[PDB]
Amino acid sequence: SGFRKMAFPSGKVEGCMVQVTCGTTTLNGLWLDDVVYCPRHVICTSEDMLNPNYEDLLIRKSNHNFLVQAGNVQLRVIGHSMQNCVLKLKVDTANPKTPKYKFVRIQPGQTFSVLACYNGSPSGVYQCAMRPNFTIKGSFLNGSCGSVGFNIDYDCVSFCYMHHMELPTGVHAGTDLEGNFYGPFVDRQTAQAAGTDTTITVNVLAWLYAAVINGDRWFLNRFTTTLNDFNLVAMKYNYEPLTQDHVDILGPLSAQTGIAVLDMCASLKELLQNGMNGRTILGSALLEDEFTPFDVVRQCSGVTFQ
Amino acid sequence: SGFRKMAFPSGKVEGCMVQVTCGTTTLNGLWLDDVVYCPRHVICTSEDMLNPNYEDLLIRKSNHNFLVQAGNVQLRVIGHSMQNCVLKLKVDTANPKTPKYKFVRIQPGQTFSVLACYNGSPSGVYQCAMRPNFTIKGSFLNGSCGSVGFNIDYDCVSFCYMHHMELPTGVHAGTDLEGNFYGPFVDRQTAQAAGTDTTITVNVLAWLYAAVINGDRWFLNRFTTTLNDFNLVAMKYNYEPLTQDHVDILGPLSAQTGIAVLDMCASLKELLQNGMNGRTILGSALLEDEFTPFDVVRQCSGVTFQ
């Protein structure tokens, strides 16, 4: 028993991190087979950031302008290309530590582990969710760009996030590994802001199921609710609407605990209406929304990875 | 910016995990050089657990009774010995992925990352503290024994914890890597209980410094307090006493923020007296005590590891 913010083991990704240096800018890159992926604003200078035209900027670069360091080893760039907001540097050496991997673009609400890096060197790993406003509440300092977010399924690494920028409220924006930003953000230093966020309802419900699996039942009640009446209360508290698809996904957790999904909804409704009244759930005094139904089942049942 | 429960990258430890099978019992072991470390209750059977005499039990075992699996590879045991509550299986092959490492026994209050494993396969990584009552609030299911807790300093892995048992309140007990339990617990299935826990004062203060580094100042006040008067209020709220050593350790964080340690204490005093009044600190509605002063500096300044 117990329940923790659990990240995936990071070793398969650690063996892919490298340093990419161009001009006066150093950041991280991801080395898979003979290609190194990194944010295209590495080719920007301190005066290009305002409204850069990356196509102009890139046609002006030579291969030898890109300095790629993998440990104590320099890789030579033999080609480059831009795909949306990511730069792809072809190098003459295939990374022998390349895991099995996919690139996937995730939906708001899904979670992933972030391996935070500086100068191609991993610093720490933590669990994140893509927020409904397509930011992530990360932990990132200067030089962290090019750090990736990821999931693992058995032996396959599904990369879903590369870090690009911090927004004025201290939250973070980035792209999938094909260079498409999550959300309306763009990689130029112009006024942008996160947009109003909401709480991921389906995830709060899964975490309440986790609490029941772990012995916390104080928040349950005998009541039930309809989906309509639940969603009417959720809107008032700035919660994402719950759909029938969400209900269906919460099926396995419902059947294992014996608490119908709509009954757990009735319970969350009273938690929103009455607060927690100085009590905690799974060590939290807040309703936690960064565990998906899959995260709960994974941790409360013990799925491993090779 | 941002602040997260950050674990160390786990790859150096992933390459050391193996499966150890003896009779009807499977658990995890730690393979460093030509030795595999694992909990000695692997040699117990379902009827030995009540009051086992491990010396009796072990002299009755042969090397070929221990089945050690490293991936798709069986290792042959060529010797065994018991050191306190850990079993050391000498195998004929040195682990080529052995990182630089130390074994260290930590003090209550120190934090570490846990790589949770089943059947020698890593499942997830998360950050823990050793609680003042020498338990850890882990996340552990059947088969998780032999999972280790660890810190990393540049390139060196300091192993500090191996998992052995869960206690009736759902918290966890284990040993250092030389087999000495943290706390008064023993590895026999007899009535044991955690003992009264306290909040790690020095860590709460460090986390309040983290919040100031990240832009939260709403909890500060103009007041100050003496150490004596602070400790008188801490005892009342079941907080560990703060010593001058603690004050000294909080020096760097004091100097970087410009908030004297005793002023931050005055702030924590009013937080304990008045609660947080529906506000949050670093996304938490509770006073968080599982970050050390070192954790804060590491994450708010970006220390990496090779």
Ligand SMILES: *C(=N)[C@H](C[C@@H]1CCNC1=O)NC(=O)[C@H](CC1CCCCC1)NC(=O)[C@@H](NC(=O)OCc1ccccc1)[C@@H](C)OC(C)(C)C
């Ligand atoms: C990458 N290594 C770096 C990571 C940042 C640094 C601190 N935390 C992080 O996550 N990324 C940047 O520093 C990045 C440089 C790029 C961004 C794209 C365009 C080319 C330069 N800059 C930022 O993240 C800045 N954010 C930003 O410009 O957002 C748009 C904006 C501009 C003006 C006013 C409001 C919003 C950060 C560093 O700047 C602030 C917002 C002050 C943190």
Ligand SMILES: *C(=N)[C@H](C[C@@H]1CCNC1=O)NC(=O)[C@H](CC1CCCCC1)NC(=O)[C@@H](NC(=O)OCc1ccccc1)[C@@H](C)OC(C)(C)C
């Ligand atoms: C290892 N793989 C396993 C990990 C546990 C399982 C669930 N979560 C975990 O962390 N360890 C055990 O299952 C372990 C077996 C050993 C323990 C030492 C002696 C030889 C057998 N057992 C336990 O962790 C049990 N705890 C326990 O016995 O504590 C002492 C006790 C005994 C009776 C009454 C109160 C306290 C667990 C599995 O049992 C309970 C407490 C019911 C969870």
